[PDB]
Design an enzyme around this catalytic site. Sequence first.
Site, short mmCIF file in Angstrom:
data_model
loop_
_atom_site.label_atom_id
_atom_site.label_comp_id
_atom_site.label_asym_id
_atom_site.label_seq_id
_atom_site.Cartn_x
_atom_site.Cartn_y
_atom_site.Cartn_z
N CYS A 75 47.11 -9.57 32.03
CA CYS A 75 46.12 -10.12 31.10
C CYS A 75 44.72 -10.21 31.72
O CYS A 75 43.72 -10.17 31.00
CB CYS A 75 46.57 -11.50 30.58
SG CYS A 75 46.46 -12.81 31.84
N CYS A 157 42.84 -12.47 29.29
CA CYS A 157 42.60 -13.76 29.92
C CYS A 157 41.64 -13.61 31.09
O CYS A 157 41.31 -12.49 31.51
CB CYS A 157 43.92 -14.38 30.41
SG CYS A 157 44.58 -13.62 31.93
#
EC number: 3.2.2.-
Length: 247
Positions: A75, A157
């Site tokens: 991520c 992320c």
Amino acid sequence: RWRQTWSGPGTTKRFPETVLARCVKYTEIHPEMRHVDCQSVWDAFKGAFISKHPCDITEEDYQPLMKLGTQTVPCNKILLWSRIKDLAHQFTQVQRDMFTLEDTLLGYLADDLTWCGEFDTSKINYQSCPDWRKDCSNNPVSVFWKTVSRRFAEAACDVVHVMLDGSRSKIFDKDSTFGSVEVHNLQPEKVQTLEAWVIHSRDLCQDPTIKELESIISKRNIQFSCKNIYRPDKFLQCVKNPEDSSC
Ligand SMILES: N=c1c2ncn3c2ncn1[C@@H]1C[C@H](COP(=O)(O)OP(=O)(O)OC[C@H]2O[C@@H]3[C@H](O)[C@@H]2O)[C@@H](O)[C@H]1O
């Protein structure tokens, strides 16, 4: 015959065979997708647009395919891009420093292809397909990319990077898929920073469309960062060999 139904180019020749083979090749390379059944993936893809009116496609049409193509990406290593695909792909190819959407199974299957069907017939249209602008935006290709770009942005992320083309009229374009879909689907709870690489001279990080981007993402409670890449030729060379005088 001397005129076609839609304004855009027809489906890519051998579309069925091409998607199927791409699936095979992808699943032989990447071990975590080594179980996927490519016949069923094809079936799922087909079902999204076959016998459907090519101007009435919805994101739900694509959910069976999405489900079969579910994949975990690191991520914190996501690379987004807008209108600058060649450089973004050459970059990730060097040592997998990052992942673009086309490095996923689904992005890989559809990259560079066109497709559409017909209402009340199960034939693929090799003659023409709806143009996003002149005909309709709800066509099978445009709807596919919106759906997959959305989920890909939702999976990001930490620090997310984006490559932008500094030679275009609008370096950041609110009407592109990046500007209209991806920026609004990053999750503020998880994403700490969006960092843009402006590919070229001037300081393009001061360009009015870049200030617009900064304002949009700051108001989402996400930090913004920007860097100029003046010489993309030298930059790629430094990635391959950080052991270089110039670097
Ligand atoms: N990879 C990719 C893509 N490939 C074809 N299309 C697309 N759209 C989005 N992406 C992803 C989304 C973003 C941004 O890609 P952008 O360059 O800003 O999109 P645009 O508006 O210029 O595309 C016009 C036309 O081409 C397709 C679209 O469906 C459109 O119909 C990238 O990070 C990538 O992950």
